Design an enzyme around this catalytic site. Structure first.
Site, mmCIF file in Angstrom:
data_model
loop_
_atom_site.group_PDB
_atom_site.id
_atom_site.type_symbol
_atom_site.label_atom_id
_atom_site.label_comp_id
_atom_site.label_asym_id
_atom_site.label_seq_id
_atom_site.Cartn_x
_atom_site.Cartn_y
_atom_site.Cartn_z
ATOM 1 N N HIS E 199 0.813 -1.210 0.000
ATOM 2 C CA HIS E 199 0.000 0.000 0.000
ATOM 3 C C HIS E 199 0.848 1.261 0.000
ATOM 4 C CE1 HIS E 199 -3.597 -2.407 1.866
ATOM 5 N NE2 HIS E 199 -3.334 -2.745 0.615
ATOM 6 N N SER E 203 -0.765 -0.849 -6.553
ATOM 7 C CA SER E 203 -0.525 -1.955 -7.463
ATOM 8 C C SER E 203 0.114 -1.488 -8.767
ATOM 9 C CB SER E 203 -1.832 -2.686 -7.768
ATOM 10 O OG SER E 203 -2.253 -3.464 -6.654
ATOM 11 N N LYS E 225 -14.851 -8.622 -8.169
ATOM 12 C CA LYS E 225 -13.987 -9.469 -8.975
ATOM 13 C C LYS E 225 -13.231 -10.465 -8.106
ATOM 14 C CE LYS E 225 -10.667 -7.758 -11.830
ATOM 15 N NZ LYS E 225 -9.528 -8.699 -11.600
ATOM 16 N N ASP E 226 -12.884 -10.075 -6.877
ATOM 17 C CA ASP E 226 -12.243 -11.010 -5.961
ATOM 18 C C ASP E 226 -13.222 -12.069 -5.470
ATOM 19 O OD1 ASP E 226 -9.956 -9.585 -6.348
ATOM 20 O OD2 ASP E 226 -9.719 -8.920 -4.270
ATOM 21 N N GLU E 269 5.348 -34.248 -3.865
ATOM 22 C CA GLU E 269 4.165 -33.624 -4.434
ATOM 23 C C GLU E 269 4.571 -32.742 -5.611
ATOM 24 O OE1 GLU E 269 1.009 -34.075 -3.826
ATOM 25 O OE2 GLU E 269 1.149 -35.391 -2.079
HETATM 26 C C1 HEM Z 1 1.349 -16.336 1.720
HETATM 27 C C2 HEM Z 1 1.912 -15.684 0.696
HETATM 28 C C3 HEM Z 1 1.358 -14.430 -0.048
HETATM 29 C C4 HEM Z 1 0.214 -13.715 0.074
HETATM 30 C C5 HEM Z 1 -1.004 -13.887 1.015
HETATM 31 C C6 HEM Z 1 0.249 -12.639 -0.903
HETATM 32 C C7 HEM Z 1 -0.731 -11.683 -1.106
HETATM 33 C C8 HEM Z 1 -0.651 -10.598 -1.958
HETATM 34 C C9 HEM Z 1 -1.708 -9.654 -2.283
HETATM 35 C C10 HEM Z 1 -3.144 -9.676 -1.714
HETATM 36 C C11 HEM Z 1 -1.224 -8.763 -3.158
HETATM 37 C C12 HEM Z 1 -1.983 -7.569 -3.784
HETATM 38 C C13 HEM Z 1 -3.049 -8.037 -4.778
HETATM 39 C C14 HEM Z 1 -2.449 -8.780 -5.945
HETATM 40 O O1 HEM Z 1 -1.543 -8.247 -6.636
HETATM 41 O O2 HEM Z 1 -2.890 -9.925 -6.192
HETATM 42 C C15 HEM Z 1 0.162 -9.098 -3.412
HETATM 43 C C16 HEM Z 1 1.024 -8.425 -4.252
HETATM 44 C C17 HEM Z 1 2.334 -8.753 -4.515
HETATM 45 N N1 HEM Z 1 3.012 -9.864 -4.053
HETATM 46 FE FE1 HEM Z 1 2.171 -11.226 -2.788
HETATM 47 N N2 HEM Z 1 1.432 -12.727 -1.600
HETATM 48 C C18 HEM Z 1 2.133 -13.809 -1.107
HETATM 49 C C19 HEM Z 1 3.374 -14.227 -1.548
HETATM 50 C C20 HEM Z 1 4.193 -13.569 -2.438
HETATM 51 C C21 HEM Z 1 5.328 -14.150 -3.131
HETATM 52 C C22 HEM Z 1 5.715 -15.639 -2.939
HETATM 53 C C23 HEM Z 1 5.859 -13.187 -3.915
HETATM 54 C C24 HEM Z 1 7.081 -13.195 -4.867
HETATM 55 C C25 HEM Z 1 8.078 -14.093 -4.837
HETATM 56 C C26 HEM Z 1 5.080 -11.978 -3.712
HETATM 57 C C27 HEM Z 1 5.288 -10.756 -4.315
HETATM 58 C C28 HEM Z 1 4.303 -9.813 -4.547
HETATM 59 C C29 HEM Z 1 4.421 -8.606 -5.352
HETATM 60 C C30 HEM Z 1 5.691 -8.152 -6.101
HETATM 61 C C31 HEM Z 1 3.243 -7.977 -5.330
HETATM 62 C C32 HEM Z 1 2.854 -6.663 -6.040
HETATM 63 C C33 HEM Z 1 2.053 -7.047 -7.279
HETATM 64 C C34 HEM Z 1 1.460 -5.829 -7.937
HETATM 65 O O3 HEM Z 1 0.851 -4.991 -7.223
HETATM 66 O O4 HEM Z 1 1.601 -5.708 -9.181
HETATM 67 N N3 HEM Z 1 4.066 -12.244 -2.814
HETATM 68 N N4 HEM Z 1 0.467 -10.226 -2.669
HETATM 69 C C1 LIG Z 2 8.253 -34.706 3.935
HETATM 70 S S1 LIG Z 2 7.447 -35.723 2.574
HETATM 71 C C2 LIG Z 2 6.986 -34.331 1.541
HETATM 72 N N1 LIG Z 2 6.604 -33.189 1.911
HETATM 73 C C3 LIG Z 2 6.326 -32.397 0.672
HETATM 74 C C4 LIG Z 2 4.814 -32.127 0.612
HETATM 75 C C5 LIG Z 2 7.178 -31.130 0.607
HETATM 76 C C6 LIG Z 2 8.554 -31.261 0.478
HETATM 77 C C7 LIG Z 2 9.366 -30.140 0.414
HETATM 78 C C8 LIG Z 2 8.816 -28.875 0.479
HETATM 79 C C9 LIG Z 2 7.447 -28.736 0.605
HETATM 80 C C10 LIG Z 2 6.629 -29.849 0.669
HETATM 81 C C11 LIG Z 2 6.657 -33.366 -0.467
HETATM 82 O O1 LIG Z 2 6.591 -33.195 -1.663
HETATM 83 N N2 LIG Z 2 7.046 -34.521 0.166
HETATM 84 N N3 LIG Z 2 7.458 -35.729 -0.424
HETATM 85 C C12 LIG Z 2 8.849 -35.959 -0.771
HETATM 86 C C13 LIG Z 2 9.239 -37.075 -1.488
HETATM 87 C C14 LIG Z 2 10.574 -37.262 -1.803
HETATM 88 C C15 LIG Z 2 11.520 -36.334 -1.401
HETATM 89 C C16 LIG Z 2 11.125 -35.215 -0.687
HETATM 90 C C17 LIG Z 2 9.791 -35.027 -0.370
#
Ligand code: HEM
Ligand SMILES: CSC1=N[C@@](C)(c2ccccc2)C(=O)N1Nc1ccccc1
Ligand SMILES: CCCCCCCCCCCCCCCCCC(=O)OC[C@H](COP(=O)([O-])OCC(O)COP(=O)([O-])OC[C@@H](COC(=O)CCCCCCCCCCCCCCCCC)OC(=O)CCCCCCCCCCCCCCCCC)OC(=O)CCCCCCCCCCCCCCCCC
Ligand SMILES: CCCCCCCCCCCCCCCCCC(=O)OC[C@H](COP(=O)([O-])OCC(O)COP(=O)([O-])OC[C@@H](COC(=O)CCCCCCCCCCCCCCCCC)OC(=O)CCCCCCCCCCCCCCCCC)OC(=O)CCCCCCCCCCCCCCCCC
Ligand SMILES: CCCCCCCCCCCCCCCCCC(=O)OC[C@H](COP(=O)([O-])OCC(O)COP(=O)([O-])OC[C@@H](COC(=O)CCCCCCCCCCCCCCCCC)OC(=O)CCCCCCCCCCCCCCCCC)OC(=O)CCCCCCCCCCCCCCCCC
Ligand SMILES: CCCCCCCCCCCCCCCC(=O)OC[C@H](COP(=O)(O)OCCN)OC(=O)CCCCCCCCCCCCCCC
Ligand SMILES: CCCCCCCCCCCCCCCCCC(=O)OC[C@H](COP(=O)(O)OCCN)OC(=O)CCCCCCCCCCCCC
Ligand SMILES: CCCCCCCCCCCCCC(=O)OC[C@H](COP(=O)(O)OCC[N+](C)(C)C)OC(=O)CCCCCCCCCCCCC
Ligand code: HEM
Ligand SMILES: CCCCCC(=O)OC[C@H](COP(=O)([O-])OCCN)OC(=O)CCCCC
Ligand SMILES: CCCCCC(=O)OC[C@H](COP(=O)([O-])OCCN)OC(=O)CCCCC
Ligand SMILES: CCCCCC(=O)OC[C@H](COP(=O)([O-])OCCN)OC(=O)CCCCC
Ligand SMILES: [Cl-]
Lengths: 49, 61, 105, 48, 377, 50, 50
Positions: E199, E203, E225-226, E269
């Site tokens: 914020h 965005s 939309k959400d 997985e």
């Molecule tokens: C539990 C994990 C996460 C949650 C709940 C989350 C949630 C959100 C939400 C609600 C927004 C704003 C709305 C949208 O753009 O969809 C956002 C934006 C963003 N997120 Fe996440 N996110 C998560 C993980 C991540 C990850 C894994 C990355 C990158 C590696 C990331 C990077 C960003 C960026 C760069 C934005 C800005 C996007 C924009 O406004 O154009 N976030 N996130």
């Molecule tokens: C703990 S067993 C496990 N946990 C998961 C869900 C996981 C691993 C790593 C990160 C997130 C989730 C997955 O794919 N495996 N299986 C598995 C099978 C072979 C080798 C490693 C993991």
């Protein structure tokens, strides 16, 4: 025609023309903060009523 | 020039939020009966004579 | 001057039409990523270019929302793309580099 | 291995039917509100 | 107007109602809220599973069984939680891909903690999959925890200290359950800091160009939309729950854990298969582990590799192609990861593994420099 | 405390009375429907069943 | 990138060098002391014991 008017009359008359009706809006100037039309339109009713 | 059904629904039910909400809750009550009634009737007509509801009459005694 | 630097322009005209911001009625300088240097250059634009830049961007965000483009007649022609911002931007950078050279004296 | 087999399919049928109703209705609410924007028209009138 | 002055509803107002948002953000911007929903679902289904699950090897397998057979509607709760986790990783990977294609990583603070949000979810789902205590749970837990044995000098100490023994056993299953319980709340806290930094700027949008000239309020436009997006999220989940619950789950996990023999072929997985492939692509212990860490920590240094004078790839065809060669390459590594270390999957896994790091570190940075020169700046 | 008893406040009471009694119908019907309260739902004709 | 190599920046480097090497002594000694690293702590005379 005025003395007839009481509170019941204005509530009935106003609801007839104001409540849940689509307004016409016109803006001019620095109107970035002018609410969007959907927000304006939702201001024409109360969820409590 | 009698108002259509949609217009008479609005004037009587929807204009007030309270009556709009009352008919949602009542609409949910009567929708629930007819939906689970009709839906279950399809699920078993497909699977006629396949599950316990149908063969319950054999093993009564 | 020659035929070799002319198909060079032909592939730059090609990349231009492929990049497709001209399909939204936009110019190259409308798409520059705003950093501190660019925000300064935009600040320095005269009123006519600033207001034009505002509307072209607004027109494009409108189109982008609808996933539409302008008719081909109204696309930005590669020949008529005024690099209106790079003169201002090049002077901003030039000033910043001067500060940076003084900062290490 | 899966005593819930029959019950899950009965639920699955109800889930598909409700989604076939709710998805276009919610889609319709989205389009309803957004129509203000999707049909908006712009004009640029700078002084000369 | 009380919506704008009550100290509690003020923070809600500035985040969900009157928040200015761009007018042109596409469905790829829906996945932020779907991550929040996914998290909420994993809290609730997770919580109601924890009221009937027991955390010890003797009855850990049986308590999950007890849920799917005896407790009212626990089988549906359990598959929601299992498939909810997979939907979580779908949304995660769309979320990141959106950020890369459209250049949202330039929000350094938001992005760099987003990386942290990715790691903690992986750590959660890892410690969740151990809890049912099936075969895949046990040996998948064995392969992962032994990655720390590759650290020089202090490796074995950290593993046995994590284990609470000399192998994954009763002591691990208990603490892993404790960690799996508490981490999703830490996630929610960091997700709140995710929004706080977001914020600060607002965005991005499909064009990479500032949308200050044309903003709309978040409500009613993106609230609806959400909702629509969430209703499609429930659809995806319920199709998996109610018509294909064991499609993503491996059969081997339906046999109690046996610490004496492995299955002939183990596969994570789907949401971890691309990274498992990178690990196996190297015939070295410490090399494979480091290549696995950098496979994910590569995201932290994407912002340092931005060369284009434009932000989004919408107007960069040469970057688009390299972007989709990365999705295909990642889709390739996922396939190898699900296949046994045998010819020709081995050599394919190495070529796709180089192509992954080659694209991010070389081809895409220089591809942006080219198209800058094609545009004369 | 007794600011709110006079001519105008009894008029406001009588203006919002028809509305509050309807929100009591929403809540009451909503409570019956959610909890499946059988003591009420027997006299209403159609839902009788299952 | 190369803003930070010139006369003034090498002067700043040489001004803060004595300090950073001391914070490395704090961290290094702090790491030995916290983890009870025996490979180092044997040559220092007095702590030898237990
Ligand atoms: C539990 C994990 C996460 C949650 C709940 C989350 C949630 C959100 C939400 C609600 C927004 C704003 C709305 C949208 O753009 O969809 C956002 C934006 C963003 N997120 Fe996440 N996110 C998560 C993980 C991540 C990850 C894994 C990355 C990158 C590696 C990331 C990077 C960003 C960026 C760069 C934005 C800005 C996007 C924009 O406004 O154009 N976030 N996130
Ligand atoms: C703990 S067993 C496990 N946990 C998961 C869900 C996981 C691993 C790593 C990160 C997130 C989730 C997955 O794919 N495996 N299986 C598995 C099978 C072979 C080798 C490693 C993991
Ligand atoms: C689930 C919990 C439900 C909580 C409901 C809270 C009810 C409430 O606060 O009453 C205020 C509200 C006052 O609205 P109003 O009469 O139209 O007057 C507007 C004000 O002047 C002030 O009007 P305004 O223009 O300043 O603000 C308009 C406001 C009006 O609507 C609200 O204030 C709703 C408050 C948020 C409820 C969250 C639902 C969950 O709309 C919103 O901003 C809410 C948007 C929510 C977006 C969330 C996206 C996810 O009264 C009700 O709507 C009560 C009816 C609810 C039926 C309950 C079913 C039984
Ligand atoms: C389910 C898996 C679907 C994978 C998504 C495929 C791409 C897509 O169409 O996104 C739809 C949808 C449309 O969003 P949008 O805001 O209108 O445009 C987003 C991009 O800017 C879209 O980029 P664009 O502007 O360059 O256009 C790409 C084009 C892609 O159009 C197509 O490829 C569909 C061609 C099928 C023709 C009918 C043959 C049957 O998108 C459309 O025209 C809308 C799809 C219409 C579907 C009609 C099917 C009948 O985007 C998404 O939801 C992406 C996430 C979907 C993942 C779901 C997996 C769970
Ligand atoms: C995991 C879950 C992932 C969640 C993804 C989040 C998706 C989201 O939140 O945004 C939905 C986003 C909303 O699209 P939109 O509001 O219509 O605006 C699209 C643009 O304005 C683009 O304007 P346009 O004029 O190019 O729109 C083309 C038109 C599609 O044009 C067509 O008519 C293709 C249909 C061919 C059927 C031929 C039969 C004759 O609309 C669509 O692209 C939506 C395709 C959905 C078709 C469903 C059947 C109705 O796109 C969708 O995917 C809508 C699907 C909603 C299901 C409706 C079922 C009834
Ligand atoms: C403390 C409370 C915590 C609750 C937390 C909930 C977590 C959210 C998970 C959402 C799952 C979706 C539905 C699955 C159940 C099922 O499939 O419903 C099966 C039942 C049939 O059931 P039956 O025939 O057995 O009985 C019949 C007795 N008359 O009808 C359905 O098909 C309804 C499902 C329709 C389609 C889903 C649309 C989703 C709308 C959003 C609602 C979400 C509300 C959230 C409230 C917190
Ligand atoms: C690290 C995790 C690895 C796990 C492996 C997962 C297996 C991969 C399976 C592949 C599924 C692919 C989903 C379908 C994508 C279709 C996109 C398309 O139809 O349109 C292209 C679109 C172009 O549209 P513009 O935005 O340029 O302008 C529009 C003008 N009307 O451009 C865009 O819409 C692109 C936006 C971003 C798409 C997100 C998909 C990427 C997923 C993984 C990325 C991870 C990278 C580290
Ligand atoms: C103890 C037991 C108690 C049980 C009580 C039961 C009560 C049931 C609900 C009834 C309340 C109805 C209130 C009402 O409809 O107003 C809310 C808004 C208004 O709609 P709108 O059409 O904007 O305005 C109507 C104006 N009017 C009244 C003058 C015609 O209506 C809508 O806009 C709502 C439509 C969207 C609903 C979806 C929200 C759920 C979240 C997302 C779900 C999917 C993923 C989680
Ligand atoms: C982002 C949050 C979460 C994710 C991604 C997640 C993921 C998972 C996964 C993949 C499993 C394996 C399920 C199986 O193989 O059967 C699992 C199991 C489990 N989870 Fe979670 N979980 C989350 C949050 C929670 C929370 C907050 C709790 C409790 C308060 C919880 C409680 C459990 C329990 C008790 C199990 C074992 C029962 C079972 O295997 O179904 N989870 N989780
Ligand atoms: C239990 C009932 C809860 C009622 C919530 C509510 O009505 O919120 C406001 C809007 C519609 O009202 P409005 O925006 O037209 O304003 C009217 C002004 N008079 O509705 C929505 O779009 C919000 C979606 C909530 C999802 C969690
Ligand atoms: C506050 C939470 C209420 C929880 C009630 C509950 O779990 O459901 C039990 C009854 C069932 O109706 P009945 O006709 O069997 O009657 C059975 C009588 N024991 O439903 C009720 O009677 C609803 C009453 C609500 C009052 C606040
Ligand atoms: C990052 C967390 C470090 C955890 C280390 C640990 O748990 O303690 C083990 C050793 C003990 O010293 P040692 O002389 O027995 O040596 C035993 C050799 N295995 O202590 C160390 O060697 C400290 C090293 C710290 C490096 C970052
Ligand atoms: Cl099981």
């Amino acid at each position: 025609r005025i003395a007839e008017v009481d509170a019941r009359v204005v509530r009935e008359v106003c609801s007839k023309y104001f409540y849940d009706q689509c307004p016409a809006v016109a803006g001019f100037g620095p109107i970035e903060q002018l609410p969007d039309y959907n927000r304006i339109r939702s201001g024409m009713f109360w969820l409590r009523f | 020039v009698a108002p259509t059904l949609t217009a008479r629904l609005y004037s009587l039910l929807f204009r007030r939020t309270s009556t709009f909400a009352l008919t949602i809750v009542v609409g949910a009550l009567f929708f629930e009966r007819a939906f689970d009634q009709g839906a279950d009737a399809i699920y078993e007509h497909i699977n006629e004579g396949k599950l316990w509801k149908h063969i319950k009459h054999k093993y009564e005694n | 001057v020659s035929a070799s630097s002319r198909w060079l322009e032909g592939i730059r005209k090609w990349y231009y039409n492929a990049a497709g911001f001209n399909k939204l009625g936009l110019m190259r300088d409308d798409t520059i990523h705003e950093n501190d240097d660019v925000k300064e250059a935009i600040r320095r634009l005269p009123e006519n270019l600033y207001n034009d830049r505002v509307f072209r961007i607004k027109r494009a965000l409108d189109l982008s929302m609808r996933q539409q483009i302008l008719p081909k007649e109204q696309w930005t022609k590669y020949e008529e793309d005024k690099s209106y911002l790079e003169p201002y931007l090049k002077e901003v950078i030039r000033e910043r580099k001067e500060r940076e050279e003084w900062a290490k004296k | 291995a899966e005593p819930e087999h029959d019950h899950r399919k009965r639920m699955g049928l109800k889930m598909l039917l409700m989604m076939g109703l709710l998805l276009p209705l919610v889609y319709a609410m989205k389009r309803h509100k957004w129509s203000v924007l999707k049909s908006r028209k712009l004009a640029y009138r700078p002084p000369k | 107007n009380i919506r704008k002055s009550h100290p509690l509803m003020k923070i809600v107002n500035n985040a969900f109602i009157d928040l200015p948002a761009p007018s042109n953000i596409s469905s790829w911007w829906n996945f932020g809220s779907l991550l929040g929903i996914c998290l909420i679902l994993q809290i609730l289904t997770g919580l109601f599973l924890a009221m009937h699950y027991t955390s010890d090897t003797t009855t850990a397998f049986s308590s999950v069984t007890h849920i799917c057979r005896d407790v009212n509607y626990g089988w549906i709760i359990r598959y929601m939680h299992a498939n909810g986790a997979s939907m979580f990783f779908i949304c995660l990977y769309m979320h990141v891909g959106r950020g890369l294609y459209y250049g949202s990583y330039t929000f350094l603070e938001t992005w760099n903690i987003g990386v942290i949000l990715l790691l903690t979810v992986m750590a959660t789902a890892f410690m969740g999959y151990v809890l049912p205590w099936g075969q895949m749970s046990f040996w998948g837990a064995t392969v992962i925890t032994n990655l720390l044995s590759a650290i020089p000098y202090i490796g074995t100490n950290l593993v046995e200290w994590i284990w609470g023994g000399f192998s994954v056993d009763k002591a691990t299953l208990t603490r892993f359950f404790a960690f799996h319980f508490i981490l999703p709340f830490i996630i929610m806290a960091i997700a709140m800091v995710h929004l706080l930094f977001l914020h600060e700027t607002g965005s991005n949008n499909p064009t990479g160009i500032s949308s200050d000239v044309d903003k709309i309020p978040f409500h009613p436009y993106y609230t609806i939309k959400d909702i629509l997006g969430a209703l499609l999220l429930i659809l995806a989940l319920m199709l998996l729950v109610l018509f294909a619950p064991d499609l993503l789950g491996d059969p081997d996990n339906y046999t109690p854990a046996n610490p004496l023999n492995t299955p002939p072929h183990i596969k994570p997985e789907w949401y971890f298969l691309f990274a498992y492939a990178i690990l196996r692509s190297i015939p070295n212990k410490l090399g494979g582990v480091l290549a696995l860490a950098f496979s994910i920590l590569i995201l932290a240094l994407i912002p340092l590799l931005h060369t284009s004078k434009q932000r989004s790839m919408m107007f960069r065809p040469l970057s688009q192609c390299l972007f989709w060669a990365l999705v295909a390459d990642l889709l390739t590594l996922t396939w190898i990861g699900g296949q046994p270390v045998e010819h020709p999957y081995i050599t394919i896994g190495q070529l796709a593994s180089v192509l992954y790091f080659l694209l991010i570190l070389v081809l895409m940075p220089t591809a942006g420099t080219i198209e800058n020169k094609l545009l004369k700046w | 405390l007794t600011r709110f008893l006079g001519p105008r406040y009894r008029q406001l009471a009588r203006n919002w009375v028809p509305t509050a009694s309807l929100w009591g119908a929403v809540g009451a019907v909503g409570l019956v429907w959610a909890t499946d309260w059988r003591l009420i739902l027997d006299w209403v004709p159609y839902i009788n069943g299952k």
